[PDB]
Amino acid sequence: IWVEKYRPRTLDEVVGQDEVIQRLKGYVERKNIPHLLFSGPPGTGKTATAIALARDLFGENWRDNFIEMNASDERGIDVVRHKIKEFARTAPIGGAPFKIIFLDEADALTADAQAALRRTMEMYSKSCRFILSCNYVSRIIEPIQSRCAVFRFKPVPKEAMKKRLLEICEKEGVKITEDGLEALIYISGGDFRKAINALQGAAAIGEVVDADTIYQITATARPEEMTELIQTALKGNFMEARELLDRLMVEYGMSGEDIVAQLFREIISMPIKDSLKVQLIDKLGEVDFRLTEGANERIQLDAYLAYLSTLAK
Amino acid sequence: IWVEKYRPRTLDEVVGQDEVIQRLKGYVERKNIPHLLFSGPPGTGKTATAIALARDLFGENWRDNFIEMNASDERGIDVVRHKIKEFARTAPIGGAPFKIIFLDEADALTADAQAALRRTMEMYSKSCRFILSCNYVSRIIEPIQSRCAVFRFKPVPKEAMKKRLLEICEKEGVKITEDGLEALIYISGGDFRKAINALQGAAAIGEVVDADTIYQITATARPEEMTELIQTALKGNFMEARELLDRLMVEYGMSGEDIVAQLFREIISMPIKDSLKVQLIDKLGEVDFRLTEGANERIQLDAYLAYLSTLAK
Amino acid sequence: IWVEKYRPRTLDEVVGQDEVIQRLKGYVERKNIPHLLFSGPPGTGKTATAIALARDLFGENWRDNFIEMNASDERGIDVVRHKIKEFARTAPIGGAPFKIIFLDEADALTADAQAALRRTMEMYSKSCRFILSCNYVSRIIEPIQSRCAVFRFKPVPKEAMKKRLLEICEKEGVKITEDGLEALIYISGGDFRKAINALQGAAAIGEVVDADTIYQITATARPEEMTELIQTALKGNFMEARELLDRLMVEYGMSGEDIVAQLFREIISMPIKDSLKVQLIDKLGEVDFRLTEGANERIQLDAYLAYLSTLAK
Amino acid sequence: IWVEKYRPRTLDEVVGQDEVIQRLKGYVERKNIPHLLFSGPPGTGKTATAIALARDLFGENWRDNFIEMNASDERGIDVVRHKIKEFARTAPIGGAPFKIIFLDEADALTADAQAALRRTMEMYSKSCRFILSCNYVSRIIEPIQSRCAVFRFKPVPKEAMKKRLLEICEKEGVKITEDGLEALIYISGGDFRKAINALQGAAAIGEVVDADTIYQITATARPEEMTELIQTALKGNFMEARELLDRLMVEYGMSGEDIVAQLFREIISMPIKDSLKVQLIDKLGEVDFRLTEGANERIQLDAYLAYLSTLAK
Amino acid sequence: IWVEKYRPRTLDEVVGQDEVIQRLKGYVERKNIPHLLFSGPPGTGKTATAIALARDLFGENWRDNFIEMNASDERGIDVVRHKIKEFARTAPIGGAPFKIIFLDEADALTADAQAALRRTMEMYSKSCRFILSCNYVSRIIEPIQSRCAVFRFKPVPKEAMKKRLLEICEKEGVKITEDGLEALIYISGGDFRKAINALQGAAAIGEVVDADTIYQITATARPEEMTELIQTALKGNFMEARELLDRLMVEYGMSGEDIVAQLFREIISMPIKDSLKVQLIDKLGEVDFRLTEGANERIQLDAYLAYLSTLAK
Amino acid sequence: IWVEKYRPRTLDEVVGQDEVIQRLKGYVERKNIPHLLFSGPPGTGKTATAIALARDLFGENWRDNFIEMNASDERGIDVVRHKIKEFARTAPIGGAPFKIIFLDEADALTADAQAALRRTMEMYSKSCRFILSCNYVSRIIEPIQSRCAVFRFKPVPKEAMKKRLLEICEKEGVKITEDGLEALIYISGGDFRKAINALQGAAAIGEVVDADTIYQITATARPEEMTELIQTALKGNFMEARELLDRLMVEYGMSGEDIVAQLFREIISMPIKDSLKVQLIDKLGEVDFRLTEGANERIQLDAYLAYLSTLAK
Ligand SMILES: Nc1ncnc2c1ncn2[C@@H]1O[C@H](COP(=O)(O)OP(=O)(O)NP(=O)(O)O)[C@@H](O)[C@H]1O
Ligand SMILES: Nc1ncnc2c1ncn2[C@@H]1O[C@H](COP(=O)(O)OP(=O)(O)NP(=O)(O)O)[C@@H](O)[C@H]1O
Ligand SMILES: Nc1ncnc2c1ncn2[C@@H]1O[C@H](COP(=O)(O)OP(=O)(O)NP(=O)(O)O)[C@@H](O)[C@H]1O
Ligand SMILES: Nc1ncnc2c1ncn2[C@@H]1O[C@H](COP(=O)(O)OP(=O)(O)NP(=O)(O)O)[C@@H](O)[C@H]1O
Ligand SMILES: Nc1ncnc2c1ncn2[C@@H]1O[C@H](COP(=O)(O)OP(=O)(O)NP(=O)(O)O)[C@@H](O)[C@H]1O
């Protein structure tokens, strides 16, 4: 179950987030915790450090006190309040003063539920504490940011993830190549869950973990193939391009969105002129719309390879 | 009821999917099942192999344990949880350790319901197991892919379906012709349920199963007619084409989308130049949008036959 | 602790609220107080004037009598009733007839608790008085508005805050620029706590308080950057713009909405022609739609920087 | 229930409609009734005088004969025809020759149902009669106007409604102020039902009926607020205006249409130049369209406050 | 009941339709009737001549045989077929060979019901005959036009209606002026029902029938007023125009459509340049749309007077 | 009576239907006839070839045996069964084995009557034969298609009709121009009866058969007029255009749809640039929408001639 079995066990073990951790460490020496607001992309380590933060302060007795719950399940803020009263009357067993509750997906709620936090903030800051996880800070109404120290998680930098990917490997006897790592990171988007999980799935199989074995397991074209199809499209060979994208869409079985996504990437990282690149993206912008409005995948897609083959002359 | 009466009874019997089955077999020798994630087009064999997988592991006592339910019926994830507790307390009767629940249409739910899986994964991996079927893997939030072995079902090729269709016939004393088979496949889109079901419906009637008897039972324009209308359109005979498509749209009573769809197919499998085929498809891509935005069927359609009749010279 | 150390000490010292104060002064000459209902946005000076109102009537002996408490903490209306009997039996020491209790967040309660006020209104209007603070008057059930003089606080207008910001500076030897001020107000949302507090945080640092030093301390896109990216986009440098917006979106980690928002602001407060400014906003209006329909953030956004770089010529 | 308890009891008692009544009286002396067509805004007295007209001709025995039904409930023209045969065979008990049926919302039906009237007109003009109420005469197909005397109800002026509102009060021991009356009329749109009904609802509560108590009970922005927001918008304070309208839109929870409506009113009754008022209204006319086409409420609205803040200089 | 009491009683008595009648007379001398197709605007005399045609051929015994029914009441084509068998077995009593059935609103049906005519055409052309009335010929599927002599009724010319209006008057002792006639014809649109019916309503009242008394009874502005408001609008006096249109809309109480209609007429028959007239109509074209989509009458209207007052300079 | 006097007298003489005839000829050499199923649009030659098929097999003695009857006249399938027993007992006089019955409008019947065919199929395939004509094959329940050779008549292509029109002329001393022909086909809809019949009606008159003489005899807008009005509109003469379209709409009394239709046609077959032609049709596409939504015919139409006269410069 890798993404768990490698849940960092200490602040020091969460990586790529010096930014936060460096200064979240200065909360363990003093044993102060104001209500934490963790904000960032998903799979970057809010839940992780919000464990390892609860873990560095309680030693061995965290699981007893800390509880993670998803804030977006609307009718349970008020059903998990009796957990707020047993938890707040119990003194941290050992020698610590305070206690923690984690709240994933905070930024899903409308103004109201957000308030109910507040009458356990000033009632329990000599006992309880909240850690709020949210995709964006902007989406949490001011009255809470008010009483929160705030931490912006960044999508995890290259080397720092690449290194911890290796550790996960060497220690699991899996052979990635250089190819497979770099590729496991085109994939990852800077999101461990995605990265670990993928690696896991390539590890499951037979041995050497190639560039490809990775592109395949996630269903994401070899970037060579994309810029081959965008190219043979621009050349004028419509039926040929259509062929490719088809094969291409079954080899790995991507959604429409998924294809239009990589079409983007590889359109951006073409080395063609800033003058044409626009035309291409503008229209891709169109196509992606059509699809989300629920028009037809096959037709809009091919209909975009069609686009490219007009700009032949 | 053919589509059932030929539900594969063993992993060996599910075809065209070596890919998955080959390595899904290595889960019966060991008697390991992690939560399965079946992803692919519809009518390729997720439900099928997710039966024959439950069937190969329990012998004669599968029906008792395995239950398929559709995950998209939003208010019943939590109403079919009491099926999760009776099922999880019952030991597989005979000599096996584990048990299975199938969940069609997983990729219809928003983040939340997806989580509720998780507190029966680590609670029941010494007892219960889930098999998740989904159109695309991309659409199932990472936290689950996390705890799933994943299988990408591919559309089952021509011959392999054509062969199993015959088996379904010979063994049911139905006379298809060659026409009727090839036709039964234009239809099928590479989707058995659609294919079997249609055959069934032609079998029900009187005897010989023709090209036509198949185009009729599914309501679908003869491909000759389409490429006749697209042809007389291109030649310049606008009023004539408009006539055809009209007659055509009542003979079988197709939607706008439906017409625009076969218009595509037959525009692609025209033997005209990769140069013009684009112009046609680019514009079809336009029409189809118009329509889904809710503009006017008759007008946009005829408006597209108009298109084709400018490119006369 | 600025927000406190500059709590106005007299009705005269609360600003931008002439509206209320002008006519709340005519309650100090007569020494009449009916139950006050303060309504307005948060951070505009209900609590403040509800102090300076208690302060102008008791001189030096206010703290002894006046007590602020939060009304939303449901189980304490009735636990802070013994404060209602000691307080109501004590005659205002000196030469005044009456006494005051402040109740923040009144508009959080359901019908019932609201009533319990009433049997201390007609029992204590020859002794006690309430000041009720609420986000909106509409939310306080009629039977109370009934026995309340009512005051609508308005978000503190520009100049009035800008002036009192300056007084807070000159008297604290802090150098704001014009930029800093105006920026300190883009920030402030018309909410002093936010404003003072921020200013504080910029004063803490080294000297001159710039437009930027303010956008930094609160964490927001520097308006310089936006109008730099919209510029380099309009110039034709699409890849460069895309680059900026990307860095830009991580430096601060804004949503799509969030970016489309500042994109707007800085599109409006561009000094370009009313002729083009439309084109821009019309299309932004489009983008923002796409996004809310759930199309793709990265694609629509870059797809709009694409837009801007067609209008190069 | 005021709106009923003050249903006029005689033609004399229906007010502001001399126009009609004056000449509808000349139908009681002669005891002639051709099929009446009442047309006008809603809440002006069609139903009312169509009662008091039935009441002035039958004395005490009207309720027995006269029946009002709503004509827009499509499948009941033909289900309330057996009421047409029992009613038409019964002679007006006492000494009168004829009888009446009222039909609210006539102008909702398509051509067909309208005809079915006709074979009870020439069949029952020596017995039955219809009174048709409709928003506009233009909307009732000629073949009926044909056989109808027609009456155009006009919106009942200010004073005349203001006077009858007082009568409804004085005689019900309710204390309106001047404010509350004038306000109860901003509200009323010149439509009693709305006006009475609202008053009723303010009467229900505690005592004095203020300007406010009226704006509240109907949920409607204080006109001061609107022209404050339109003002601070015009001055240049976009963020401030956006703030107001937001607060404003929750305080009372208005639709987009609803806001755009009062925006109109107060834009018209601004005391600004006939020169600019146009620019404002032209654009409002734009916004309101956008919205009804289903574009985005928040964006178009704010987008219109944006408009007003360009015309600063 | 004028529109009936002046139902022409012979072909000779139907006016303005020489066109048809001239050659519909040549069917009475021969006593031939093929199935008649009457097509034209409403209220021009299809039903009328289709009576007077049935009346000129049967003398005194028409009512017995001829029956008019509305074809659009879908479930009764087949319920009024037993009227087709009693009617077809009965020989025209006296000395004539054939018989007639009239069918109003033919052009409302879909293809199918249209056919059911046909098996009583060739079955009853030695006995029965149909007269089909329809707004437009184009809307009646060919297979019927096939077996129909066809007659296009034109909106009734000026003098021919004006003359028969007079006859209706002199013979009813009503005093129209020249004004009132001409005006009763601006009104009429070339549609007697509308014209007669209106006259009737002006006759009902007191004596002299003026230009105005006519504009009032139909709710249609004095054309002077319109071109006054369109003028004071174009001059720049927005509030003044808005005032007018308001008064104007109550004086006669027109719909939105109704106002936009006359706005059209009087915009066309302005004597302004063909260059501006366009701008005005283009926008009116817009406004009328907005309204039919259900946007707001008051706002779009005024919003169009707003338009006109921009084009001041 | 042309449509008859040119009823083809041999399979060779039926034209444009090679398709069928080519392979319906191979039934005369062998003298085999299984039950024929003719399907196609009306007026394409089912009845015709179903005569000339009966005519090529019997020589001079067809009329005696063959009988056409209409199948939709419900109560006569069973009344024309005694024609089935006299006909089936009579041996084809001369030297042929079999005999024929034609059944127009087959596709009008419900399941039941369809069966009664069957007990004269296997009872008379050594004597009798049926030829079934139907608008669509899809509409004839399978159990019959079962025992039918099937033939799809196609709308008679351009040249093939144009040629046989000429033969009808040259051999009748009538002078069509090229114009007349091409026009006689715009008319014909690809339906001879319509075409021959019309030609007939133009031949009747004086000499040369023009484009016009044809548009007249059938009643349609002269295509000259349309492209005159669209022209004078584009030139800038709005009032003049409006005038034309008005006259134009009464001369023939077209619907809005009807006018928008020819507007299209003549917009397409304008010889203007593919660049403007779009602008035109895009807007026509708009207009036609407005209308179907039920906005105002006169206003939208003139409002579109307005459109055309902006694009003057
Ligand atoms: N920043 C990180 N450093 C090291 N390991 C990580 C990090 N992020 C995730 N992992 C591993 O990947 C899994 C995902 O953790 P985590 O991101 O906290 O869960 P999440 O809530 O779904 N995404 P997030 O909201 O950013 O926390 C964890 O259980 C970790 O073991
Ligand atoms: N790949 C396949 N191999 C063998 N038989 C199949 C296959 N796909 C379908 N069939 C037969 O056709 C029926 C439909 O197949 P299957 O895809 O397994 O279930 P489904 O309800 O139609 N859709 P899905 O979600 O793809 O599983 C089954 O009951 C099978 O017996
Ligand atoms: N013009 C009026 N004169 C006197 N009383 C009125 C008038 N309009 C309304 N009222 C009182 O207010 C109530 C509503 O009036 P009225 O218009 O007659 O019926 P309605 O159901 O509200 N709408 P409508 O379709 O205009 O008749 C009535 O029951 C009247 O007693
Ligand atoms: N052309 C006419 N000449 C003389 N009187 C007419 C004419 N049209 C209508 N009238 C009178 O006005 C009434 C309307 O008649 P008519 O137009 O036949 O009914 P309609 O069906 O509603 N309109 P239409 O469909 O054109 O016949 C009649 O009953 C006539 O008395
Ligand atoms: N394909 C053809 N070749 C030659 N003449 C034709 C053809 N189709 C029609 N005609 C002439 O036009 C008339 C109509 O054709 P025909 O099909 O016999 O009448 P119809 O029955 O109304 N059409 P249908 O019902 O589809 O057969 C005939 O009597 C023929 O003379």
Q: Tell if the CB–CB gap between E310 and D279 is shorter than 8 Å.
A: yes
Binding-site annotation: residue ranges of E for ATP: 40-47
CATH number at residue A169: 1.10.8.60
Nearest CA to B238 out of F194, F189, F286 is that of F189
Q: Does C238 touch chain A (CB under 8 A)?
A: yes
Pull the structure tokens for residue A53.
């933060």
Strand partners, B70: B104
Rounded distance, CA A288 to CA A292, Å?
6
Pull the structure tokens for residue B148.
């799933």
Q: What is the CA radius of gyration of chain D?
A: 24
Which ligand is located closest to the Cα atom of residue A191?
1
Calculate ∠ Cα D47-D48-D51, nearest 5°: 85
For residue D245, give Cα distances in angstroms to B192, D253, D261.
57, 11, 13
Q: Token pair 């319920």 is at which residue?
A: E79
Q: Does D240 touch chain C (CB under 8 A)?
A: yes
Based on DSSP, count helices (H) and strands (E) in chain D, helices before strands. 14, 5
Resolution (A): 3.5
Q: Tell if the CB–CB gap between C304 and A292 is shorter than 8 Å.
A: no
Q: Does C310 touch chain A (CB under 8 A)?
A: yes
Cβ atoms of residues D17 and D103 within 8 Å:
no
Q: Is residue B60 exposed (0-12), middle (13-18) or buried (19+ Cβ within 10 Å)?
A: exposed
Domain co-membership, F126 together with F64: yes
Evaluate the CA torsion angle A178, A179, A180, A181 in order and state its sign.
positive
Q: Does D237 touch chain C (CB under 8 A)?
A: yes
With a CB cutoff of 8 Å and minimum separation 6, the contacts of D60 are none
Domain co-membership, E33 together with E130: yes
Rounded distance, CA C64 to CA C87, Å?
9
CATH number at residue D235: 1.20.272.10
Based on DSSP, count helices (H) and strands (E) in chain B, helices before strands. 14, 5
Task: Report the separation in Å between the CA atom of A45 and the middle of ligand 1, taken as the mean of its atom positions.
Answer: 4
Cβ atoms of residues A190 and A161 within 8 Å:
yes
Domain co-membership, B7 together with B97: yes
Nearest CA to B21 out of B162, B149, B151 is that of B151
Total number of domains constituting chain B: 3
With a CB cutoff of 8 Å and minimum separation 6, the contacts of A63 are none
| Amino acid letter, B27 | Y
- Which among B156, B171, B204 is the end of a domain? B156
Strand partners, D101: D67, D130
Cβ atoms of residues F264 and F256 within 8 Å:
no
Q: Which domain covers residue C255, as residue numbers?
A: 221-313
Q: Is the CB of A48 under 6 A from ligand 1?
A: yes
Domain co-membership, E83 together with E150: yes
Q: What is the CA radius of gyration of chain B?
A: 24
Q: Token pair 């759930």 is at which residue?
A: C294
Domain co-membership, A140 together with A284: no
Rounded distance, CA C44 to CA A150, Å?
25
Q: Which of A72, A239, A299 sits opposite B284 (nearest CB)?
A: A299
Which residues from D are below 8 Å from C186, CB to CB? 239
Rounded distance, CA F96 to CA A154, Å?
93
- Which among E194, E220, E246 is the end of a domain? E220
Largest CA distance in chain F: 81
Q: Token pair 């084509």 is at which residue?
A: E77
Q: Is the CB of F43 under 6 A from ligand 5?
A: yes
Domain co-membership, A141 together with A188: no
Any idea of the CA torsion for E175, E180, E184, E185, to the nearest 10 degrees?
120
Q: Is the CB of B48 under 6 A from ligand 2?
A: yes
CATH number at residue C148: 3.40.50.300
Calculate ∠ Cα E129-E130-E131, nearest 5°: 130
Domain co-membership, C185 together with C270: no
Cβ atoms of residues F217 and F202 within 8 Å:
yes
Reading across the β-sheet that carries B101-104, which strands appear in turn?
A: B67-70, B101-104, B130-134, B36-39, B149-152
Q: Does C311 touch chain D (CB under 8 A)?
A: no
| Amino acid letter, C305 | L
Q: Tell if the CB–CB gap between E254 and D279 is shorter than 8 Å.
A: no
Residue to mutate, D193, D194, D199, ligand 3, most ligand atoms under 8 Å from C-beta: D193
Domain co-membership, F176 together with F196: yes
Rounded distance, CA F39 to CA F47, Å?
11
Strand partners, A130: A101
Strands E101-104 and F130-134, how do they pair? unpaired
Q: Is the CB of A188 under 6 A from ligand 1?
A: no
Domain co-membership, B98 together with B204: no
Nearest CA to C283 out of C310, C244, C246 is that of C310
Experimental method for this entry?
X-ray
Cβ atoms of residues F131 and F36 within 8 Å:
yes
Which ligand is located closest to the Cα atom of residue E4?
4
Q: Tell if the CB–CB gap between E281 and F302 is shorter than 8 Å.
A: yes
Atom of ligand 4 nearest to the CA of E156: 1
- Choose the mutation target among B138, B139, B265 for the interface with A, i.e. most A CBs under 10 Å: B138
Nearest CA to E167 out of E41, E2, E1, E28 is that of E2
Q: Is the CB of D48 under 6 A from ligand 3?
A: yes
Domain co-membership, C2 together with C143: yes
Cβ atoms of residues C55 and C21 within 8 Å:
no
Domain co-membership, A163 together with A288: no
- Which among A103, A128, A156 is the end of a domain? A156
Q: Does B142 touch chain A (CB under 8 A)?
A: yes
Domain co-membership, F211 together with F123: no
Closest C-alpha to ligand 4, atom 28? E7
Rounded distance, CA D118 to CA D134, Å?
18
Pull the structure tokens for residue A167.
């550790």
Rounded distance, CA C257 to CA B218, Å?
46
Cβ atoms of residues E45 and E156 within 8 Å:
yes
DSSP F151-216: EE-----HHHHHHHHHHHHHTT---B-HHHHHHHHHTTTT-HHHHHHHHHHHHSSSS-B-HHHHHH
With a CB cutoff of 8 Å and minimum separation 6, the contacts of A211 are A177, A179, A180, A182, A183, A222
First to last CA, chain C: 54
